Structures are given as C-alpha cells and as structure tokens.
Design a protein around this ligand. Structure first.
Ligand SMILES: C/C=C/C/C=C/CCC(=O)[C@H]1O[C@H]1C(N)=O
Ligand SMILES: C/C=C/C/C=C/CCC(=O)[C@H]1O[C@H]1C(N)=O
Ligand SMILES: [K+]
Ligand SMILES: [K+]
Ligand SMILES: [K+]
Ligand SMILES: [K+]
Lengths: 413, 414
C-alpha cells in the first residue's frame, strides 16, 4: 500500500492570547503578551509571580453548567477546542463516517486540580465522600474520551502523555494513523490546565519557573537574562484528514503534515542531553520522514521555553542539523507570548506553524533585550515577518528525555 | 511514498505481578490456577467497602537497586524499570552506542505516580510548598516509566507513553508494534505498569462502585460468574521486547511469537459505562482481525478483558458472539484477572505476556472461581483447569473508561 497524504482541515484553540484561533493567531503576529499576574492560585506562597492564563473564559458559553461540572478544566479546554476545530473544518460526522473519525489528544498531567480538591475532601470528610466522578475527571485520557463523545467519533482513539512533548507527539501519532490508512480523520493535539497549587509548588521546587516578577520581561526565550519558563494553560486541537477524503467533500486545506520525528536522550530525568543531541536527532528523523533536505526548512517554531539550558541547547541542535543554513532560516519562540502550555504547547505551536504557512507570516520572539552570545541565531525579534513559507518545523522536548518534531508543508495539489 | 511493512516478533518478556516477581513464576502459577488475591495490606482498608486486592508478594525493590535510587522512583516506575530490565535480559539484547537510536521504549501507565502525588500534596498542605520535593514532578508523571527505562537501557529511539485507562497496556504494545512495522525502530521495549493501590485510588473506585465489595478472597474475582460484583484491584508491570524480524534473526534472538494485529476504537458513548452490547469492543476486535488479514475462525483463544463486573463480562460475551458468530462457541475464552486481579494500565501488558506464552507453550490458562453459571455468559471460559492445546492465533482484549477499546492479535512463529 501507498502512504496516504495527510492535510490539516480545521483548527481550534483556547490560549492565553485568545479564546479562539483567530484571536490567538492575530495576537501572536502582533507581538502581544499573554502573561500577567497569577490569579488562579495565591502567588504569595511561590517565588513565581506571573503566569499565562486564559482571560474571560466562561465554559458555560459552550455547554450546560452541569456538563462542565463533570469536567476538569483540562477536559473543558479540550472539548471546546475540538468542537471549534470540527466546526472550522465544516466536517459532518455521520454514522456512516464515524468509525473512520478518531481522536488522539494528549495532556501532560490531566486533572490535577480535581485530584487536589478531591484529596482535600478525602482528608477532611473521609474517603466515603470522595466523588463518584473523581476517577474519570482526573485521568488524562478523559479529554480524548469526552471529545469523542461530544463529536460522535468512533475511530482510532488514544492519548499520548510525554510531558512537554505531548502535543507534538499526539499530532505525529495521529498523522501516522492516517498515513497507514487506519482513519480518514483524526482530531488531535494537546490540552493542559496546570495552573494549580502542586504544579506551582513542583516547578518552583526544581527551579523550572521564572521568578522574574515583571510580566513584561519574565518570558524571554534566547535572552541572556532568561531564568525559567512562565507557565500557561489552554488547548490546541487540529483536524488531520486523508487527502482524497478532504478533496471529495470540498474541505478547506490549511497545509500538509509531512514529517514526524521522535527520539529519547536516555540521559537524565529532567536535564537535556549535552549540545541538544537528542533534539538534533529528532529533527533529523522528521526531515528524513518528509524526504527533504534540511535547507528546505524556512522557519522553525522552537520549543524555546526561556530556560537557560533549553534555549542554549536547542540553538546548538539547530546548528548541528542545519549547518550554514542554521543562520539563513528563521527561528522563533511563541512561548515569549503564550507562556509554556506544557502538554498543550505542541498543539498551539502546530496551529501557529500551520497558519504561518497559510498566511505567509512568521510570528516573532518578543522580549529579547540582551543578546546572548550562545544564542546567536535569527529569532525574529519583536516584529512579525511577512514571508512566503514552504516548510515549517516545530520542536517540543520534555522531561524524561522526550524529543519530538513535526514538519508542515504548504499544500500543493 | 511506499508504506513499509516489517514483520514484528516477540524476543523478550519481563513481569512483576500478584502471581510472581518474574515471568516464569507468574506463568506457572497462572497455568496452575493459583490466586494472587488476598486481604489488602498496602493501605488500611477499614474505611473502604473493598477488603481484598492483588498485591505483589515479597517484592523488595532494594533487591534490584540501591535504596537511594528507589527513593527517587514511584512504585509504578520501580515496577516498570525492574520488569523492563528482566525483559531485555530475557531477550539477551545488548544495546550499544551503535543500535541505541533504533531501540525505543513505549510503556504506558493509567495514572502514574499517584502515591507520590498524594504524599507530596499532604506535605504541601501540612508543611508548605517549600517542603515539596524537587523530584515531585518527574516522579509523578506517567511517562517517567518510559523515561527511566530509557535511561537505564540507553535506548535512544522512538519514545512514548500511551495513557488510555484500562486499555493502556494493550494500546502501548500495539503502538510500539506499529512503530516497528513502519520501519521507525528495530526494537521496542513496551507494555504497561501500574501501582494503583493507594488511598485515593481505593476511595475513587469504591465511590464509583467499580470494586467488588466481596470480603472473601476465594470468590472476589470471578469473571463470567452469575454473582460477580466488581473488579479486584491489582498492581505490577508487564513488559515485552518487540523486534523487527530480520534484526532478531541477525543477532540470533529467540522468538516467542509474532504480533500481527492491532485494533483501536472508541465507543463515543459514556465516560465510564461501556456502549450497548459491547459494540465498540466488537469493532476493535474486527479491526485487529482485518489488520492481521485473517478470518475470525482462525482465532483459537481469546484472553478476555474479563474484569468481573456485571456489564463488562456480559457485553464482552456479546461482542465475542457478534464478531465470531457460531465460532464463538468453538474457540476458548479465559480471564486471567480471575487470578491476577485487575492491573489497570498494566493489565494489557501482563495479559499480552500470557497470550504470547499460551502460544509458545501450548497451554491455555483457566478462568478460576466460576461457581454459578450465568445464562448471559455461556461461552467456554476454560473454567478451573488449564488446557493443553496447540494454538496458532490468540486475541487479547482491553477496554477502558473514556470508551477506549483495544485488541491485539498474536500468532505462532514458524
Ligand atoms: C504538572 C505537569 C504538567 C505537565 C508536565 C510536563 C513535564 C514538565 C516539562 O516537560 C517542562 O519542563 C519543561 C520542558 N522540558 O520543556
Ligand atoms: C485511580 C487510578 C487510575 C488508573 C486507571 C484507570 C482506569 C479506569 C478503568 O478503565 C477501570 O474501570 C476499569 C475498566 N474499565 O476495566
Ligand atoms: K528559575
Ligand atoms: K514548537
Ligand atoms: K461493585
Ligand atoms: K486481555
């Protein structure tokens, strides 16, 4: 059998930059920051003072209150974003095509807020007052579960959990499902609602978070004075579709997914391998998968978390893979604006990568004020660039040494 | 534009289960109808309606690693690392700098480090966030089993963690199977791990009435029995080494069997309740049969999901009839959860191992504890006693919350 071509036919998102794709994207290409003071928890207890939160998100605008009450925020975001994506796709999921429409959405930690609140009930009211809905509300695969129920999607059904690589791995895995002919449509991406007491406690404890109290400068990928990531929340979901299936229904096509790379550092639980060698290998695997030369890559949407090690090592990995071309292509980290959505990062960044191609605009890295000699590539500082793009690469890396890369291409017949 | 299709064989097995702290012990107990269920000891069960569980017996992690290393791993990760090392040793696989990028790891867990989360959050509440460990986040996340296995083995290839509730172990193995099939790794260390015997897990599964409240360990787990009343929770890890065939042959590997089919569907029905008549499960079995390119009649033995809840065993029986027709009464079905309890995310891992060994050894493990026939569950559940038989194809089912259905098909290797 021949490999199927896989195109992107719908986009859905909730992010700190907007409660839909258009607003999120429009804010991104105008260098708008989604970072502000923490409100979701009490910032007094942590060295971190800022976060990238959804603004003005009222879940009841999208579903009944009683339905939302049986969903952790991570699931709420996923269901809202998935429905948005399917509506954008104008896909009618009938009984006839339901077994060929699947869902592959990941989350890095799933319903942590629900776990915390229920454990507190356990401690104060006793185990017999834990909710009958606790288990399904907490497990990370309930985003996929609830999405499939909301959509009537009966096909291949999964959830990848790979830390900060989650959103990228999930999309790549869905891509492979369609390539091998096991689904015609996959609703896929990542979702995360990690703004909780234990998440702030945990990422403070290992010094991962920026302790910069100024929301204007906290997230500054590649900057000499970067000091950690700024945590965000949301979901980025796309509809992937087999090409002939898309054409036959007159689907709109944003672009094509053509390459996916997955490697492991096998080095350390949290620290990236020296020189970003594992990330270099993942990019090389994605490039070989797409059947292109490295020079064909026009823009890299970096993982670019604003930690010391990540941005330095990702720069090294890019130089290793692209050689002289590393100084010719454009790189940017949109985490400068959205913050780090953890398991949802790969999802929103896939959306930005796809729209960069569709609209011919490279979103900038904001907040670079002090150049770092070790991070000397072209990070598209401050201002978006209008440019025709043919190929875009997006990286995600995670704890556990996960490296994941996707390559997107401008759709040509 | 060519779609690569490699053959994928099983070259190593490793396990910790309530039936033993290795594969040989677990397997020999299974074919002898031995129960791994007893009183709960891991937590104080006075405040839960459930009184029995399937725990590892005499598992001391310090027998496998230094205490200092164990203290940086949640039990779910301990089990995964120990089982994975056993699987790689069984495979006699030497991972070097040279083949490292072609060796990957795909181990799932349903919930990951829940005990760590409970203990660290109680510390947060009682002592404050400064007392939360720098190791809390990596210790808790489900993919740390894959991460720690990767680090221990030096495996640098395709790397992932599927989390699909009670389908987790089966999905993980199928996903690893597809990686090798499409040419993206030569070896995958894959399976499921779970350490769900915790205060919140017992509280949660009591609150939704999933657990059996039967206080008698002799009858608590009784899949397909008229008086079944919920599952008995267990723990452990089942890990296997999948390998591309020519690679396995080149290094002189021993081959237990071949993986040939994988089916994944969603009910799209309810967050916890299975779809009417197990229709989604039937579709997953049908997809796996199609993937394997065989007729339903070629299946000799089904290792059922068989959790001992009313609805699972009833609907799984219906699904089997739907898929196999008259052949449903000709093949053998059994649930080894009658002996192991329900290992949740690790269930598909240990059950994959039992399915593979059933083929290699030509022995079908029984369903124990069936005393009262249920008119609705009237298939051949291989009751009480193992059955010696030459098997060519075995199918293993898993189903989970979120409406996940996953099926694997294994084949005898020439
Ligand atoms: C509370 C956890 C939510 C999801 C967890 C993600 C793992 C942490 C990461 O991978 C982030 O450390 C950042 C990175 N390596 O990009
Ligand atoms: C609290 C621990 C969660 C880890 C595993 C969750 C799986 C939930 C399920 O799918 C189980 O209900 C059993 C089943 N459907 O077989
Ligand atoms: K920091
Ligand atoms: K990226
Ligand atoms: K029950
Ligand atoms: K099974």
């Amino acid at each position: 059998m021949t490999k199927k071509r896989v195109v992107v036919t719908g986009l859905g998102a909730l992010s700190p930059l907007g409660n839909d794709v258009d607003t999120s994207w429009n804010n991104a290409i105008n260098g708008v920051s989604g970072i502000g003071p923490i409100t979701r928890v009490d910032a007094e207890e942590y060295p971190a003072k800022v976060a990238a939160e959804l603004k003005d998100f009222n879940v009841e605008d999208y579903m009944d209150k009683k339905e939302a009450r049986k969903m952790d925020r991570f699931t709420q975001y996923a269901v809202v974003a998935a429905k948005m994506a399917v509506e954008d796709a104008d896909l009618n999921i009938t009984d006839e095509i339901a077994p060929r429409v699947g869902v592959w959405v990941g989350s890095g930690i799933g319903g942590l807020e629900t776990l915390e609140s229920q454990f507190e009930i356990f401690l104060t009211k006793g185990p017999r007052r834990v909710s009958p809905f606790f288990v399904p509300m907490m497990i990370p695969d309930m985003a996929t579960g609830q999405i499939s129920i909301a959509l009537g999607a009966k096909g291949v059904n999964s959830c990848t959990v790979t830390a900060c690589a989650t959103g990228t791995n999930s999309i790549g895995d869905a891509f492979k499902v369609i390539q091998r002919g096991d689904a015609d449509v996959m609703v896929t991406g990542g979702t995360e609602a990690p703004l909780t007491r234990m998440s702030f406690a945990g990422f403070s404890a290992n010094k991962a978070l920026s302790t910069n109290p100024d929301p204007k400068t906290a997230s500054r990928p590649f900057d000499k004075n970067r000091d950690g990531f700024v945590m965000g929340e949301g979901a980025g979901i796309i509809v992937l579709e087999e090409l002939e299936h898309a054409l036959a229904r007159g689907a709109k096509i944003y672009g094509e997914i053509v390459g996916y790379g997955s490697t492991g550092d096998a080095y350390h639980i949290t620290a990236p391998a020296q020189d970003g060698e594992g990330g270099a290998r993942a990019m090389q695997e994605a490039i070989k998968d797409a059947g292109i030369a490295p020079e064909e890559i026009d823009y890299i949407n970096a993982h670019g978390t604003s930690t010391y090690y990540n941005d330095k090592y990702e720069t090294m990995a890019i130089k290793t893979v692209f050689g002289e071309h590393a100084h010719k292509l454009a790189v940017s980290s949109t985490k400068s604006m959205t913050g780090h959505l953890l398991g949802a990062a790969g999802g929103i960044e896939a959306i930005f990568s796809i729209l960069a191609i569709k609209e011919g605009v490279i979103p900038p890295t904001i907040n670079i004020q002090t150049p770092d000699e070790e991070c000397d590539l072209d990070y598209v500082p401050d201002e978006a660039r209008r440019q025709e793009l043919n190929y875009v690469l997006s990286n995600s890396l995670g704890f556990g040494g996960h490296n994941a890369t996707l390559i997107f291409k401008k759709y040509q017949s």
